[PDB]
Scaffold this active site. Structure first.
Site, PDB file in Angstrom:
ATOM      1  N   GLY A 184      -6.460   5.208  -0.416  1.00 47.93           N
ATOM      2  CA  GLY A 184      -6.496   3.831  -0.267  1.00 47.93           C
ATOM      3  C   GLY A 184      -8.244   3.211  -0.267  1.00 47.93           C
TER       4      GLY A 184
ATOM      5  N   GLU B  25       1.036  -0.977  -0.464  1.00 42.86           N
ATOM      6  CA  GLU B  25       0.582   0.202  -0.119  1.00 42.86           C
ATOM      7  C   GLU B  25       1.010   1.121   0.267  1.00 42.86           C
ATOM      8  OE1 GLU B  25      -4.373  -0.930   1.737  1.00 42.86           O
ATOM      9  OE2 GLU B  25      -4.090   0.757   1.839  1.00 42.86           O
TER      10      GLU B  25
END
Lengths: 139, 139
Positions: free
Chosen positions: A83, A63
């Site tokens: 995200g 991420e």
């Protein structure tokens, strides 16, 4: 060339100060026209209690890498990226060395980005694969 | 009662020494007959560079919590559990306070476990939902 902002590894690394990437030893290592690469140590900072790389730490690397890749692809004067959805298959355990993640674009849409992120330990064998969906949000 | 080993929060927390859970301030907080709860600080240890909780750190909390839940459910003299697949929707951003995750079982099969993990910030609103698949592996 995928990129809007040309990746600058020093600034990418420097921007991690006082965030989890810094704490875990994540380092942006390389880039080319279609990919961005970062790595992370496999040690006590990133182990789970049994001495293997924590599956979540694999996801932090993925991420971090994909979020940064999105940031380099959007018009940052008007948008930021967060995200939205992440998933990963844990393929092989790692105990030491480093784990290296390479991000490639699957789809850069107007409102979402989807990244393919491949991780491997120092032996070169696939250790984790992630796919990350980012939301593009107006400032 | 879901549990094979009765959860002991002191030993759960103590077992994190020299692993990422310790480094990030993860704390096992509570349990009952059908759930296990842990929390993590939202600060510089767990932020991404823009000052929000890193989506990967949410996943570290979720996988720490579910992995431990699986460990308390298997015959540890014959089996161990490793992460196989994890996914999460990031619902709301968090900037400070703590994020609290609660794990509940979806399915405890012979060879895989599936956990439902719900996270929320101190305001009580859902911040992330994860589902974790663990593999049960013979020692």
């Amino acid at each position: 060339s995928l990129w809007r902002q040309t990746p600058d590894l020093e600034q990418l690394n420097a921007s991690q100060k006082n965030s989890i990437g810094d704490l875990l030893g994540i380092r942006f290592e390389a880039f080319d026209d279609e990919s961005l690469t970062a790595s992370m140590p496999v040690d006590s900072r990133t182990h789970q209690p049994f001495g293997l790389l924590h599956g979540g730490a694999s996801v932090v690397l993925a991420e971090s890498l994909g979020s940064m890749a999105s940031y380099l692809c959007v018009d940052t004067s008007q948008y930021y990226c967060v995200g939205l959805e992440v998933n990963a298959n844990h393929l092989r355990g790692l105990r030491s060395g480093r784990v290296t993640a390479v991000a490639r674009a699957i789809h850069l849409g107007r409102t979402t980005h989807v990244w393919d992120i491949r991780l491997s330990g120092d032996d070169g064998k696939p250790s984790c694969i992630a796919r990350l969906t980012m939301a593009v949000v107006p400032l």
